């Protein structure tokens, strides 16, 4: 039944930065990595962990060690055999004092990684942490030691390997990256699970959602996440079908607490209270999506079904009062709030090509103007904005942004204060009581006990409003009407693309 052949052209509004899971922080990079490389495990469309490169994984010492046997006969794109050496190399990099990436959180539970045979590795942990089995194993792309094994770890991120000479063992091989235009990949004929059916996959960079929709209509791209507002338009396009479901994601406003304006919890609570988030969803998403009050996706087994968290529902006069109570009032008749010789004025950034977020930024500007807060909007190209938000820059006052969430629910990576300096706590949030809860939660094995203790963490994050949570988005995936073998995955848009085929 399955038929070999064809070319998929995937439209993307964001350009990748590099292809290396130890350094990338963004979904566009991750999309390409998942085609180029292999991983010990893979989380499937039901969010279950499955073996991929691993032949077997045995949990030892109550979760303080993992003995991993690797499939034999797996080749890198250069024809060389993947072995334990490569796995030991790759997972040892973030344990080096010279590691300069933002992914330290994923590996900090590791004490060591040891070769036990040509195809066998033992992982040893310093303490129990479910992030290792459930996140590190499926997130860590295996790199070739015979290429990178002697590059100084301080210089690994800059290496040309990560941009235009990547060599992996994944289902597609790198052909070309025409900067600002596209990345072209070709089926790996020697892929360990069998060659892809598709001959090529092209990731076409179009930082303008309207332009991408027009290209989809014309047949210049044939796979795209259509904005909800364009659904009724796109469903009429020739030769296409659309698969729709909830994304493992939320969209938010990040308030940078490096900025004086956003250090006070009461001010952050006021900003949320000033925003008509239901109207945002109605207006900007045409009602397609739900307002978010919790830093977790409804898809998660950890999502709290029966929790009453503070919501900070829209109330313009209450926001005014809260800001006055916090010391802000217009003291110069200019219409904008004033405190200690400073005016409440800042820049709200978001990413070029996401018309929904661009619109949200304008709506936030208008709604906050009504309570005397001045916002300048700024649209920035995706790769640059990723660079700006990350350490060592944190170069934003506020941003409209999203997370593609981890499939293993743990807020430590994003909200623990230890993750500010070199991790994903871009907004400089610190609640010492929340820190303790998140740290202590790692040792809780039973899921019911874990979820129960997480109710307290959600309460603290909700109360503190380090973000204004905006909504849980839906994906609307347009694809060729004859595309077979596709399964909807809420996190990986191109999940198992090597198994998709075009019926002819």
């Amino acid at each position: 039944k399955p038929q070999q052949g064809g070319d998929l052209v995937v439209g993307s509004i964001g350009e990748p930065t590099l292809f290396n899971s130890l350094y990338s922080t963004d979904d566009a990079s991750t999309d390409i990595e998942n085609m180029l490389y292999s991983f010990l495990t893979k989380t499937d469309e039901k969010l279950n962990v499955k073996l991929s490169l691993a032949e077997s994984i045995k949990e030892l010492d109550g979760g303080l060690a993992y003995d991993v046997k690797i499939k034999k006969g797996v080749k890198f794109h250069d024809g060389k055999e993947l072995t334990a050496d490569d796995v030991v190399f790759t997972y040892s990099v973030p344990l080096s004092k010279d590691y300069k990436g933002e992914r330290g959180s994923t590996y900090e539970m590791l004490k060591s990684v040891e070769k036990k045979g040509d195809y066998e590795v033992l992982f040893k942990l310093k303490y129990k942490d479910g992030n290792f089995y459930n996140n590190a194993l499926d997130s860590t792309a295996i790199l070739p030691k015979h290429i990178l094994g002697n590059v100084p770890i301080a210089d690994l991120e800059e290496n040309e390997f990560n941009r235009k000479k990547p060599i992996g063992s994944g289902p597609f091989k790198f052909k070309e990256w025409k900067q600002g235009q596209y990345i072209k990949l070709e089926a790996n004929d020697d892929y360990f699970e069998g060659r892809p059916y598709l001959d090529t996959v092209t990731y076409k960079v179009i930082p303008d959602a309207n332009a991408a929709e027009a290209q989809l209509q014309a047949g210049d791209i044939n796979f795209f996440n259509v904005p909800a507002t364009d659904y009724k338009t796109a469903e009429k396009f020739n030769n296409l079908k659309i698969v729709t479901d909830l994304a493992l994601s939320y969209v938010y406003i990040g308030w940078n607490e490096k900025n004086e304006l956003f250090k006070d919890k009461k001010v952050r609570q006021a900003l949320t209270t000033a925003l008509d988030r239901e109207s945002i969803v109605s207006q900007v998403l045409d009602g397609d999506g739900e307002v978010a009050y919790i830093p977790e996706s409804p898809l998660s087994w950890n999502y709290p079904k029966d929790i009453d968290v503070p919501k900070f529902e829209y109330n313009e006069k209450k926001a005014k009062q809260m800001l006055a109570e916090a010391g802000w009032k217009d003291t110069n008749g200019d219409g904008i709030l004033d405190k200690d010789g400073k005016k409440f004025s800042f820049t709200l950034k978001t990413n070029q090509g996401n018309k929904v977020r661009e619109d949200i930024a304008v709506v936030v500007q208008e709604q906050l103007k009504k309570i005397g807060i001045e916002v300048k909007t700024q649209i920035v190209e995706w790769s640059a904005l990723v660079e700006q938000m990350n350490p060592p820059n944190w170069d934003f006052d506020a941003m409209v942004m999203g997370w593609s969430l981890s499939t293993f629910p743990d807020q430590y990576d994003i909200f623990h204060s230890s993750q500010i300096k070199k991790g994903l706590n871009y907004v400089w949030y610190k609640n010492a009581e929340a820190d303790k809860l998140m740290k202590d939660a790692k040792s809780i094995s039973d899921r019911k006990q874990y979820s129960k203790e997480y109710e307290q963490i959600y309460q603290k994050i909700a109360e503190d409003q380090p973000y204004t949570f905006l909504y849980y988005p839906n994906n609307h995936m347009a694809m060729p009407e004859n595309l077979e073998g596709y399964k909807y995955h809420p996190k990986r848009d191109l999940y198992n693309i090597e198994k998709w085929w075009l019926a002819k």
């Binding site: 963004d26 979904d27 994923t106 969209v251 999506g289 990413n351 090509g353 996401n354 909504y471």
Partner: peptide, 9 residues
């Protein structure tokens, strides 16, 4: 799999 900044939605 771990958290990533997402461009879409």
């Amino acid at each position: 799999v771990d958290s990533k900044n997402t461009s879409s939605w």
